[PDB]
Design a protein around this ligand. Structure first.
Ligand SMILES: OC[C@H]1O[C@H](O[C@@H]2[C@@H](O[C@H]3[C@@H](O)[C@H](O)[C@@H](CO)O[C@@H]3O)O[C@H](CO)[C@@H](O)[C@@H]2O)[C@@H](O)[C@@H](O)[C@@H]1O
Ligand SMILES: OC[C@H]1O[C@H](O[C@@H]2[C@@H](O[C@H]3[C@@H](O)[C@H](O)[C@@H](CO)O[C@@H]3O)O[C@H](CO)[C@@H](O)[C@@H]2O)[C@@H](O)[C@@H](O)[C@@H]1O
Ligand SMILES: OC[C@H]1O[C@H](O[C@@H]2[C@@H](O[C@H]3[C@@H](O)[C@H](O)[C@@H](CO)O[C@@H]3O)O[C@H](CO)[C@@H](O)[C@@H]2O)[C@@H](O)[C@@H](O)[C@@H]1O
Length: 114
């Protein structure tokens, strides 16, 4: 019932912790790198239960699930993962920071989810 979310540019996996930090790390087989989608648009960490979330400033974090639009995501067939509220797309770098930015076509904004 859970998937990994892997960056097409870096190969690192979307990951998060109990404090709500979101980051990418190389694959390690743990459950903090796994995510569920229960059908309401949310992307929930398999380990912590918290929902992937972001703001207009481009911060990405996890928070307890609150039913708001900032916790809803749209997965495109081309690999973009877009915040429903802000319209910004999930992005990450070689350092492992995660953020959102306007879509720009680069592979840092493309993800393989499965
Ligand atoms: O440490 C126990 C935990 O290890 C693995 O989980 C990974 C681990 O990451 C460390 C560290 O590698 C990393 O630099 C920072 C994030 O940038 O987080 C931690 O300091 O622990 C975090 C959660 O605390 C995980 O997100 C990460 O995948 C993995 O072996 C896991 O199964 C195990 O419980
Ligand atoms: O405040 C109205 C907004 O609330 C809910 O969205 C959440 C909200 O979080 C607060 C605060 O709880 C949070 O700690 C910080 C960031 O950690 O941000 C906010 O000050 O606002 C952020 C965006 O600013 C959302 O990401 C977060 O889920 C939710 O009821 C939402 O629909 C509503 O508009
Ligand atoms: O740097 C060349 C890179 O540009 C485009 O990728 C974006 C770029 O973003 C910067 C910066 O715009 C932003 O302020 C911070 C976060 O707020 O992120 C980056 O520092 O670089 C990163 C990767 O290092 C990308 O994730 C981001 O989308 C894009 O044209 C890309 O193909 C190109 O290599």
């Amino acid at each position: 019932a859970s998937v990994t979310i892997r960056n097409a540019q870096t190969g690192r996996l979307l990951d998060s912790n109990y404090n709500g930090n979101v980051y990418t790390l190389p694959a390690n087989g743990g459950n903090y790198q796994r995510w569920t989608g229960p059908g309401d648009g949310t992307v929930r960490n398999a380990q912590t239960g918290r929902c992937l979330d972001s703001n207009y400033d481009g911060a990405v974090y996890t928070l307890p699930c609150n039913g708001g639009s900032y916790q809803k995501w749209l997965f495109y067939s081309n690999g973009y993962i877009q915040n429903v509220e802000t319209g910004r797309v999930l992005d990450s770098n070689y350092n492992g920071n995660v953020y959102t930015l306007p879509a720009n076509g680069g592979n840092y904004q493309k993800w393989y989810t499965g």
